[PDB]
From a paper:
Bacterial multiheme cytochromes (MHCs) attract much attention for their contributions to extracellular electron transfer whereby electrons are exchanged across the cell boundary and consequently between internal enzymes and external redox partners. These processes evolved to allow the capture of electrons for anabolic reactions and the release of electrons from internal oxidation during anaerobic respiration. Thus, we investigated whether amber suppression in MR-1 could produce ncAA-containing MHCs and, specifically, variants of the MtrC protein, which contains ten c-type hemes. MtrC is found on the outer surface of MR-1 cells. MR-1 cells typically present MtrC tightly bound to the external face of the outer membrane spanning the MtrAB porin-cytochrome complex.
The structure of wtMtrC was inspected to identify surface residues that might be changed to ncAAs with limited effect on the MtrC structure. Residue A293 in Domain II and E344 and A430 in Domain III were chosen, Figure 2C. Thus, site-specific replacement of MtrC surface residues with BocK has no discernible impact on the protein structure. The current–potential profiles of the peaks for reduction (negative current) and oxidation (positive current) for all three BocK-containing proteins were highly similar to those of wtMtrC. For this reason, studies with the MtrC293BocK protein and the deletion strain were beyond the scope of this study.
Numbering used by the authors: 45 to 670
The structure:
């Protein structure tokens, strides 16, 4: 019923000693929300300033108590009092005062459902605006990778609530320095030491975050202490990733008995630069060059010729001859039928037109300086309906590089395993038709690269390694825009290999409709769960009318098994015969489906599924049925 619950602390009065605190609650239409049953001041704190506990030390949140005692004022406002304010007798009205307010998900009396809400707000010791703050991060950065509105590990859903409990005082009282939040937060994302009684090694978090301070520390005018990540070096925080130093004993580092001299040597400029240098260098290399790719079908031979024009950062032509010694790999993959690829993985056309500065004999550079390659696989243009009039070609490439500079590929046999030796570059996509009519294109309106980029960064070099140059996905291959006119960077190019027939094996669920689900429900469920919005803005259910069969398993003799396309898409996470699929195989067939059968039968029945008579999935709730 209520989509968003807004909370504001509108008044703080110390006129009776302990503060009286009024909160005003509104819904998404700014109407007052009356009848909240689980509103609480989870923490009352005050801010001990930087340096007060010792030279170089951080500011800290000193505890003053909590309260679940409040009156519903019947107008949207709620007024708290404290039965046991400041039981340690440390209150100091010269300090900034903070209240952390939480409302649990639940229902009002009438049964209106109400979602969780959390906030903090800061004041001076009289309830006016505060004079100074410790505002370093905000809760939004966490939502790039952890589902917003759900608990992150435990207790709460917004980082300021974590910070309000995991204080220096909290850590000291337990004798556990590592549970102060500014230690813990880096700890649980960095693999240099384990955490918890389970000794969990954060291998996955390490792979995603990659010690990239900028995914949490973002410059902002609303966060006046945002530069603290480079301006306040302390042994307590820096040791969370640098786990091998013993500052007291002078092991791995000169002895330091306190934090008084850290900043004298570790100046902010150096700490900021050194921890971001590698991502900055790589991103600078990626934005040096681009490519513009065209393709045309020869109407008589039915082969596509692909032309690649390197350009510089301004879009100005660059003869590929001038940089060929630095091109580590360039690959061209061509399939047919963008909405339902027809060549499969084995029948696709693919070539490394360049490898470590060498042109393949099947590719040339023409006098205009463009690279030119003509397909050799039978493209079967026009042999499977109107969609098969269109070939689509994915171009990925990489350039040799060292310490932020492009370099000559000096070793012809370099196998691409050592990714410190080269940079994946901006990939491209080109369309061509046999008929010469306008090409079909795949829908890109339900999932795009901005969502992938929230967790993997916009500079994600997909598949970089021994097998591929690394595909960086940008507006180079955009061919439509959203309702606000912003170019959509789609994943339709990935279908060149992620075909309805799978990838190199029939057992991988390699079709793009299945592959991203399989990978992330298996390896990212702690971050995503059933949160379809982590990738989707909506579902394009109409696209199923353009789909054929989808490969879902391999037979015992290694050949391919196929399902009808809706059933194939749902069963990646809802395996037939498992505890995750109430429908038996027999019931699914009764709904028109083919389940792990032959390509012919699955193709024949592909528009026979009745699933959407009952199922009406939306990204907000994909489980919805009539
Ligand atoms: C948008 C549709 C995408 C795409 C194209 C990819 N991702 Fe993710 N991903 C996430 C996590 C936690 C993992 C596991 C990492 C690990 O186990 O170490 C992955 C894995 C991948 C891969 C595998 C290759 C790799 O270098 O890891 C690939 C190719 C991939 N993903 C592509 C996390 C997320 C998300 C977290 C909420 C988001 C959203 C996405 N990924 C989105 C995408
Ligand atoms: C993407 C760049 C992320 C950002 C931004 C944040 N987190 Fe994260 N976190 C991320 C991953 C890939 C993992 C590993 C998940 C797994 O299943 O192993 C984590 C882990 C955590 C944890 C540990 C709990 C756990 O699930 O293992 C915590 C407590 C955590 N993350 C908190 C957290 C906070 C508070 C963030 C905002 C300051 C935040 N994360 C951002 C990925 C990313
Ligand atoms: C008090 C009201 C808390 C809130 C808010 C948050 N956490 Fe917490 N956390 C709390 C306690 C009492 C403990 C156990 C401390 C101990 O003595 O072991 C924890 C522990 C964690 C841990 C484990 C850390 C480790 O073992 O090294 C993590 C990763 C953690 N908490 C994460 C976390 C997050 C992300 C929070 C905000 C969403 C959060 N906690 C809030 C108490 C409280
Ligand atoms: C999200 C997963 C983060 C990443 C990645 C990095 N930091 Fe961080 N940092 C994060 C949080 C939630 C906090 C606590 C903020 C608070 O209000 O308490 C911090 C804190 C720090 C600090 C302490 C600043 C202080 O005033 O004492 C430092 C010095 C710091 N972080 C440094 C730092 C560096 C150098 C990082 C990249 C290598 C980095 N952080 C990443 C969240 C996250
Ligand atoms: C994990 C999120 C980290 C935190 C917190 C801090 N550092 Fe760091 N540090 C980290 C990495 C991944 C690296 C290597 C980066 C690279 O590209 O080489 C570093 C490196 C340093 C260095 C240089 C290495 C050396 O041998 O001295 C220094 C001087 C350094 N880091 C200092 C430093 C300080 C002062 C921190 C607290 C403010 C700090 N690091 C936190 C990862 C992480
Ligand atoms: C000058 C006398 C320094 C003082 C004071 C502090 N640090 Fe230091 N530190 C200094 C140097 C010259 C280096 C190595 C530089 C390099 O690039 O190799 C370091 C290293 C560190 C590191 C990184 C350790 C590693 O990656 O192996 C960290 C995390 C670090 N220093 C932290 C730190 C702290 C917390 C300090 C105050 C207690 C501190 N340093 C003071 C020079 C000097
Ligand atoms: C042929 C040149 C490919 C292109 C183009 C793309 N992918 Fe790929 N991918 C390919 C193979 C041979 C495999 C392994 C077999 C399998 O099907 O799993 C993969 C695997 C993936 C995975 C799973 C995790 C992994 O093994 O890395 C994902 C998530 C994936 N592929 C995604 C993906 C995307 C988003 C692409 C377009 C940018 C893309 N692939 C293109 C082969 C090829
Ligand atoms: C990123 C890791 C994803 C998550 C999380 C979810 N989906 Fe997805 N989905 C993803 C991709 C790359 C694709 C392929 C798009 C293409 O061009 O083929 C899909 C596809 C679907 C479809 C097909 C219709 C469409 O919009 O393309 C459906 C019905 C679908 N996905 C459902 C779905 C549901 C219900 C999810 C939450 C449990 C979900 N997806 C999550 C990537 C990702
Ligand atoms: C992985 C990306 C999934 C895809 C693809 C589909 N679903 Fe799903 N579904 C998924 C999860 C993680 C869950 C949660 C299970 C739990 O108990 O937490 C669900 C749940 C459902 C449900 C409700 C559960 C039930 O027993 O009925 C329904 C009705 C459902 N899912 C339907 C459904 C359909 C029709 C799909 C294809 C369009 C589909 N799901 C895909 C994860 C994923
Ligand atoms: C009405 C007669 C239905 C038809 C036609 C289809 N499904 Fe269904 N499905 C239906 C119900 C009442 C439920 C349970 C809803 C709940 O919340 O419990 C489901 C469930 C699913 C699920 C989730 C299963 C699970 O998590 O255990 C999936 C993935 C699913 N259904 C897929 C699906 C397919 C592929 C269909 C066409 C072949 C199909 N459903 C048709 C009701 C009905
Ligand atoms: Ca206010
Ligand atoms: Ca909030
Ligand atoms: Ca760690
Ligand atoms: Ca282009
Ligand atoms: Ca039909």
């Amino acid at each position: 019923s209520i989509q968003t619950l807004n909370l504001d602390i509108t008044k703080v009065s110390y006129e009776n000693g302990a503060p009286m605190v009024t909160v005003f609650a509104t819904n998404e239409a700014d109407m007052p929300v009356i009848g909240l049953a689980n509103l609480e001041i989870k923490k009352a704190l005050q801010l001990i300033p930087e340096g007060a506990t010792g030279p170089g030390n951080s500011a800290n949140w000193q505890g003053l108590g909590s309260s679940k005692s409040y009156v519903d004022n019947k107008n949207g406002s709620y007024t708290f009092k404290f039965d046991a304010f400041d039981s340690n007798k440390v209150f100091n009205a010269q300090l900034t005062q903070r209240f952390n307010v939480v409302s649990a998900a639940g229902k009002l009396a009438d049964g209106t459902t109400v979602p969780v809400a959390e906030m903090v707000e800061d004041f001076d010791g009289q309830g006016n605006a505060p004079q100074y703050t410790k505002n370093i991060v905000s809760h939004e950065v966490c939502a790039s990778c952890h589902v917003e509105g759900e608990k992150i590990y435990h207790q709460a859903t917004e980082v300021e609530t974590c910070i309000s409990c995991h204080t220096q005082e909290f850590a000291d009282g337990r004798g556990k320095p590592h549970v102060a939040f500014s230690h813990l937060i880096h700890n649980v994302h960095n693999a240099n030491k384990a955490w918890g009684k389970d000794n969990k090694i954060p291998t996955v978090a390490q792979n995603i975050v990659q010690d990239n301070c900028q995914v949490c520390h973002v410059e902002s005018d609303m966060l006046t202490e945002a530069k603290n990540w480079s301006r306040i070096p302390t042994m307590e925080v820096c040791s969370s990733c640098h786990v091998d130093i013993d500052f007291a004993k002078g092991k791995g580092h000169s002895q330091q008995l306190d934090n008084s001299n850290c900043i004298a040597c570790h100046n902010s400029d150096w700490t900021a630069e050194l921890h971001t240098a590698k991502t900055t260098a790589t991103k600078n290399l990626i934005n040096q060059y681009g490519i513009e790719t065209t393709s045309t079908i020869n109407t008589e031979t039915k082969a596509a010729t692909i032309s690649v024009q390197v350009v510089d950062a301004n879009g100005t032509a660059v003869d590929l001859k001038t940089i060929l010694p630095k091109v580590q790999r360039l690959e061209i993959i061509t399939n047919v039928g963008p909405n339902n690829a027809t060549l499969g993985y084995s029948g696709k056309d693919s070539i490394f037109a360049i490898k470590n500065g060498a042109l393949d004999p099947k590719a040339t550079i023409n006098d205009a300086g463009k690279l030119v390659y003509t397909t050799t696989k039978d493209l079967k243009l026009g042999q499977n309906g109107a969609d098969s009039d269109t070939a689509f070609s994915f171009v990925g490439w990489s350039m040799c590089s060292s310490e932020g500079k492009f370099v000559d590929c000096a070793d012809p046999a370099f196998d691409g395993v050592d990714v410190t030796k080269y940079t994946g570059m901006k990939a491209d996509l080109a369309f061509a038709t046999l008929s010469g009519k306008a090409p079909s294109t795949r829908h890109v309106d339900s999932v795009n690269m901005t969502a992938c980029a929230n967790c993997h960064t916009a500079e994600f070099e997909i598949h970089k390694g021994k097998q591929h140059a690394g595909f960086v996905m940008t507006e180079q291959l955009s061919h439509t825009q959203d309702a606000n006119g912003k170019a959509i960077v789609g994943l339709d190019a990935c279908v060149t290999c992620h075909t309805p027939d799978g990838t190199y094996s029939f057992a991988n669920r390699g079709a793009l409709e299945l592959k991203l689900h399989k990978k992330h429900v298996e390896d990212a469920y702690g971050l995503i769960g059933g949160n379809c919005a982590s990738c989707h803005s909506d579902f394009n259910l109409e696209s199923f009318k353009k789909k054929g069969a989808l490969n879902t398993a391999a037979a015992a003799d290694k050949t391919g098994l196929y399902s009808t396309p809706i059933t194939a898409t749902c069963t990646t996470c809802h395996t037939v015969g498992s505890q995750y699929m109430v429908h038996t195989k027999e019931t699914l067939e009764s709904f028109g489906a083919v389940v792990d059968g032959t390509k012919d039968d699955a193709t024949s029945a592909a528009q026979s599924e009745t699933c959407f008579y009952c199922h009406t999935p939306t990204v907000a709730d994909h489980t919805k049925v009539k």
